[PDB]
Amino acid sequence: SPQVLSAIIFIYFAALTPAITFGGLLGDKTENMIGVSELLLSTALQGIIFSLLGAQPLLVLGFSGPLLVFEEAFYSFCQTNNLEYIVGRVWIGFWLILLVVLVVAFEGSFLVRFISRYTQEIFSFLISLIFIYETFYKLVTIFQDHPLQKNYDHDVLTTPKPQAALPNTALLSLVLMAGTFFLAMMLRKFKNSSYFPGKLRRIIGDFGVPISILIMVMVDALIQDTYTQKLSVPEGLSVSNPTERDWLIHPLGIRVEFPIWMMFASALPALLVFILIFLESQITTLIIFHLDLLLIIGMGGVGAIFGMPWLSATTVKEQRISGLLVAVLVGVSILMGPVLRHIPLAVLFGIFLYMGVTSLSGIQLFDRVLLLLKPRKYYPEVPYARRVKTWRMHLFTITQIVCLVVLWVVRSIKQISLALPFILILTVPLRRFLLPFIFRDMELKLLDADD
Amino acid sequence: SPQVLSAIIFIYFAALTPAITFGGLLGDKTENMIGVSELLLSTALQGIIFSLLGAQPLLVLGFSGPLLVFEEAFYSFCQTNNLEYIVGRVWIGFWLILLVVLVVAFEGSFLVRFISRYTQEIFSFLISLIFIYETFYKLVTIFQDHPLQKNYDHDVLTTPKPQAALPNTALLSLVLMAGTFFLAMMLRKFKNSSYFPGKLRRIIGDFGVPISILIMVMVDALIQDTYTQKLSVPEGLSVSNPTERDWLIHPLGIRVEFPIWMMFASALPALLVFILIFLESQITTLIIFHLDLLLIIGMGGVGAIFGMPWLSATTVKEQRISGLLVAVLVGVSILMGPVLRHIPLAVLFGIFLYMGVTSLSGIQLFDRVLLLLKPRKYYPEVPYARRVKTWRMHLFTITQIVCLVVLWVVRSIKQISLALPFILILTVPLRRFLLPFIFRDMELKLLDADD
Amino acid sequence: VCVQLRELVMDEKNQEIQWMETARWVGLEENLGKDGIWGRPHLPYLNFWSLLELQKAFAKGTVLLDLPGKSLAEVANQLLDRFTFEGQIQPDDQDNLLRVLLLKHSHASDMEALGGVKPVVVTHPSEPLLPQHPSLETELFCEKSPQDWEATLVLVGCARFLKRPVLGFVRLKEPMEPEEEPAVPVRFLIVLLGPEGPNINYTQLGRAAATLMSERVFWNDAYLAQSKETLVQSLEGFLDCSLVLPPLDAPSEKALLSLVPVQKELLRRRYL
Amino acid sequence: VCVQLRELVMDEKNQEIQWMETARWVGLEENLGKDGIWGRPHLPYLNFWSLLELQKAFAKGTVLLDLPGKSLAEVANQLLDRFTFEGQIQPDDQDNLLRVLLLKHSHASDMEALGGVKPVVVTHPSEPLLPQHPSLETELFCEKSPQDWEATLVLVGCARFLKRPVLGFVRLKEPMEPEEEPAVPVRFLIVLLGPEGPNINYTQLGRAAATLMSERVFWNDAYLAQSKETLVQSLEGFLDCSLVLPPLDAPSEKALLSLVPVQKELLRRRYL
C-alpha cells in the first residue's frame, strides 16, 4: 500500500544516513581495516535474521556512537602494544558467545530493575560531549596536516593519500561541514515551525538530514579542481584493503601470530561491551523478554567472526516484512561505491556533530545544568524545581558534573582506558546507597523520576 | 563624570564603526578619489559646527547608505561619458547652496506634513536589498578576479594592486566576512538574551559591532603570509592619491577642463540629493524647525568644496560638549592610518551586510511580507491584521512589491539611472490619491498608521 | 422606565428564526407565559452563574455610547464593526450574525400565532445540548411611560461557532422607536451572544442584565456613562449591594425579615 | 455536629498574634460578641464575594483526606508539604506560616483577659488596609454535645506576602481533641489565607465556609469524600440550591413568604 511504500523508503533513509557516517568514522580511526561496507553487510544480515525471530520485529538494530567509542579505545590499546585488533576482537566475540549461555541457562536481566534516570542521562550527555570533542579534534588534525602557508608545492600525488599539504583544503572542508550543520539546524527549526500546512512541512522535515546532505555533494561535484578527503570504497563484494583482511579470518592470525597469553586474556573487554549493549537495549524498550536480548547478544558475538562491527538497537504481520525490506535495501546499498566515493568526509563530520547536538538537546539534565547559570528569577515552572530548594538541585548537578569530569579525564588518559564502563557502572550503587543517605526520598522522587 | 566618560567613548565607537566601512566602500567604488579620511574630516568638522549651532545638539550627523548609492550612481553616470566627477559634484554643491536661500526666504518643510509610513518603510526595505545585492556582487567580483585554479604564478607583485590571481584569497576572504557576520549575529542574540545580569550583558552587547571586528583583524595579523585586500591609507593630512586630487580644487578642472555645457546642467542631481537628505532628516526627528534643516543642507553643500562627501543625520548644557567631544575624537581618528592599513576589506563588507540585515529586521512591512507566505492559521495577533481580511493586506503588499521591483529594475539599468528618487517620490501622491480610491479610510488607518 | 428582553427563538409554525420577548420591566418584572399572557408583576431574582459570567463579559464588554444610529440595520452594522475592531470576533461571522441581527421580532399578540417557542442556538439553527431549562420565573409567576421612561431592549441568543460569549451595549444619541410594539422610544440596547457553555443560562443572564439596568441609579449612570469604566464601577457598587442567600437545611421566615435591615443598608450604600 | 471558626488576631494586652474564635455552629450559628457573650442563635447569611472567592479557591483548593495526623504540628507540617507540593506556595514562606500555624488559641473565657481583638494581616504583623471590617453579624445578633457533633475547626487569616488566597482542608483518619475547649474531637479542619484583595472579607469568607460545612448533606459528602471532585460537586449542588436576594426599592414581607416554597424546592433538590 502507498502508506507502506512511503514508510519503507523513509525508514531506509533513516537507517542508511547514520550508517554512512559511522562507516566513514571507522575508516578514519582504522587505517583501512573497517569501513562502511563491512558494517553495512553486518546490519544487512542483522535486520533479516532479527525480523524472522523477534518478539518485536518492528524494532530497528542500528549502530550507536558508544560502540564506536569502545572500538576506538580498543584500537588505541592495541596500538599501545603489538597486537592483532581483528583476531583479538574475534576472541572477544568467542568470550561473548560462551558468556551468552550463562544467561540463557538462567536470566540475568535483574539489573533492568536497577537502572536509574540519573545514570543514563549523564551517560548520554557524556557521549554527546565526546562526539563534540572528537569533531573539534578533527580540526586540529587538519590544521596540523595542512599548516597555513602561501607557497605550498605543485602537482603533489594525492590519490591514495595527500603526500603534502595543499591549498584550498584546510578551510574549504571547514566551510563544507559548517554548511552541513547550519542547513541541518535550519531544516530542523523549519520542521518545528509553522511554515506550510502540517503534512506538507513535516514530510520534508522528517527527511531533513537525508536531504541536507546532497547539496554539499553537488557543490563538491561542481568544484572538482580541488581534492577533498572522500570515501575509499572498494569494488562490490570486496573487503576494504584485502591485503590486510579477507572474509575468511584465521584465529591464529593472517600476517602475525596472535599471542597465546592474549587468547584467554580477552575476556575482560567482552563483559564491558556486553554491559554497554545491555544498558543500551532497555532505553529503546521504553516506547511501550530475555529471548530477544540474548538473541541480540548472540548476533553481536557472531558479527565479529568475519570481521564486522556489532550493531545496536534503534528506533521504530507486516512487521516482519518491514524489517525484511529495510535489511535487503541496506544490503543492496553496498553497490553504490563508485558514486559514494565522491562524498567528502567533512560532510559526515558535520552531520555527526549535528546528530550529537540534537541528541544533547533532548536531555533535561542539560536543561537544569544551564538553568544553574540562569538567574533564580525566571526559571520555567517544572514540577521538580518549584517544590525543591534551588541550591539542593545545584548540589545534585555538581555531583553529576564531577562524575562526568572524572569520566572525561579517564577518557583523556591513554594508558588507563577501556575502564570507562566499570567506573560508570559503579555509579549506580552510589545512586542506590550514597544518594538516599544525603537526600530525602521525596526529594529524590523528583530529579531521577524516570517515566 | 564617569557617566559622561562612558557615554563619550560609547558614542565615539558607534560613530566611528560605520564610518570605516563607508570609507572603505567609497575607496572601492572610486579608483582612489574618495576614501575614509576625507569623509572622516568632513564629519569631524560637521560635528563641531553643528554642536555650536543646533536646536538639538545631542543629535548625531553620520552617514547613510542611500547617500553612497546616489554617489555611486553619479560615479557610474560620469563613467558613461567623459566627465570630471569631483568638479561636477562641486557644481552640484553650488546648486545646493543657491537652492538653500529659496527655502531660507520662505520655509519649504510643508512636505513633512505629506510623508507616509508606506513610502519610507518600502524605501528602507529597498535600501537594505541593495546593500545585500552589492555585498553579493562583490563575491562575483572576487571569483572573476581570482578564478579557481591549482597552479597560479609565483612572486606576483601585489603592493599597489594584485597583478594576477593568487591562491588563498578567493575563499579565505569569504571565511573572514562570514565569520564577521556570524559573530555579529551571535553577539546581537547574546545581547538580547538572558546571559549575565542585566547591565553586565547589555554593556558589551552595545559594543558587539565595535568588538566583533578586532578578532578577525587579529586573525589576519597572525596570518600575514597571504595578502588580503586592505586599506590604502595615505599619511596624515594627505589626500588619497594626491596626483588625482588636492585640498584646493579648481572649478575649471585640475587635469581636464570641465565642460561649460555641464556647468549650468548640474542642477538636476542637486535637487535629488536635497530631497533624499530632507526625507532622511524627519525620520531621525521622530524620537521626540527649518533652521536646523537648512543648516544641515548648507553644511552638506559646503562639504563638497574641498572634495568630501556629505553626511546625514543619525541617532543620539553638556549636549554641546558631547558633540564637541565626538567630533574632535573623529578628527583625531585620522592618525591611525598605519595600523588601519592592516585591516582587510572583507571585514568591512561583512559588517555592512550585518548592518543591512539588522536594519531590515526592524521593518514591519517585511514581517507582513513573510507572513504572506505563512499559512493563514498561526498569524500573531497584531492590531492591524485581525480586523482586516488577509487577501486585502496581500493586495497592499503586492502593490509595495511591484513598486520595489520597478525600482530595482531601474537600478539595474545603467543608461537610465539617477531617476530613482523621482520615481520613488511620485509614489507618495499615489498613496494620497490612488490608495484612498481603492481602500476605505478605516482600512488604510491600520497599515500605514505612522506613530 | 421600560425595559423589554427578547430571546432568539424559532417558531414551530413557520420554522423561522426570530426574536421573541420573554419578559418586560415597567415598574416591576412581568414574565411572559408560554402561551401567551404575561405573568404577575414581581421583584426579580437571579442565579449565581448568570451574574458571574456577566461580570466576566463586562470585564471585556463592548459599549457604544453616542451611537449615531436610528434603525436596527444601522446600529447592527456599527456594533459588528466595533466587535471586530475590539478583536472580539472575526470578520467571517459578521454576515450570519447580521442575518440574526435583522430577524423578525414577535410579540405577545403573535404568541398564539406561532406553533411554539423553543430555545435556538445559531449554527453554521439547532437547540442547546447542555442541560438547561426549565425557566424558573415561568414556573413561579406564569403558573405608564409619559417620558424619562425611555425604552431599553435586550437581546439574548446562543451561537456555538463563537469562541466566547460577547456582550454588546449601545446608547443611541437619541431614543428611537424601531420595530418596540409600545410607543416608547429606545435609547439603550444590549445584545448578549456566545457558544453553549457550562453554567451559562442565557435566560437567567438576560434577566440579570435587565435587573441590573432596572436599577434607578444604574439608569442614571447609563445616562451619564462616559466610558466602560463608569459602567464597570456602577456594576461593582451594584455587586457590593448584593446579598447571596446560601441553601439552608432549616428555613425560618423569622431569620428572614432580619436581612431586611441589611437590605436597607445595602440599598442606602447603593444610593451613595 | 459542632463547627467553630477562629480568626488570626492580636490581643491588645499581650500584643501577640493568636487565634481567637469568632463564631460557633451547634445546631445554629452563635456569633461571639466583644464584651457581650455568644450572640443569639440564628440562621447564617452570606455575601456574594465571599462565595465567589470561595468557589475560585475551591477550583484549585487543597484537600487532605484520612490524614495520619493527631496534633496541630503534624497536620500543620503535612499541609505545608502539600501546599508546596501542589505549587500553591513557595517553600520560603512555610516557616513564618508555620509560626502562624502554631500560635496560641484564645477562647471566649479569655476575651475579657485580652485588651482587645482586631484583625491582623501577616507581614514580613499589621492591619488590613482595604475598606473592610463589614462582618455585619455582630451588628445584627451580638447587639455539651459529643454524641454526633464531630468537631470541625476553621481558621482564617490574611497574609499580604502571599500571591493568592489559599484554601486548605484536612480530613483526619480519626477525630482528635487538640488545643478545642469543648470535649468534641476534631476531624475536619480548614485553613483559609491570602493577601488583602478587593471584595475579600475573610470574616464573611470564613462564615461562608462554616455555613457550607453546616450542611447536613455536605457533612455526609465530607465523611464520604474520596477526591476534591466530590467536594466540588457537593459545592455546585449547594450552589444550585442558593437563591440571591437583589436589593429592592419596595420591600414587602408578602413578597417574602413566597420564596419559602422556592426555598423548599431548593432544599428538596439539595437532598437529591
Residue numbers in the entry:
A (entry chain A), B (entry chain C): 420 to 707, 720 to 747, 775 to 909
C (entry chain D), D (entry chain B): 67 to 190, 194 to 212, 228 to 263, 270 to 362
Authors' account:
Anion exchanger 1 (AE1, band 3) is a major membrane protein of red blood cells and plays a key role in acid-base homeostasis, urine acidification, red blood cell shape regulation, and removal of carbon dioxide during respiration. Mammalian erythrocyte AE1 is a ~100 kD integral transmembrane glycoprotein consisting of an N-terminal cytoplasmic domain (CD, residues 1 to 360 in human AE1) and a C-terminal trans-membrane domain (TMD, residues 361 to 911 in human AE1).
3D refinement of these two classes yielded 3D reconstructions at a resolution of 6.3 Å and 6.9 Å respectively. Both the TMD and CD dimers have an elongated shape.
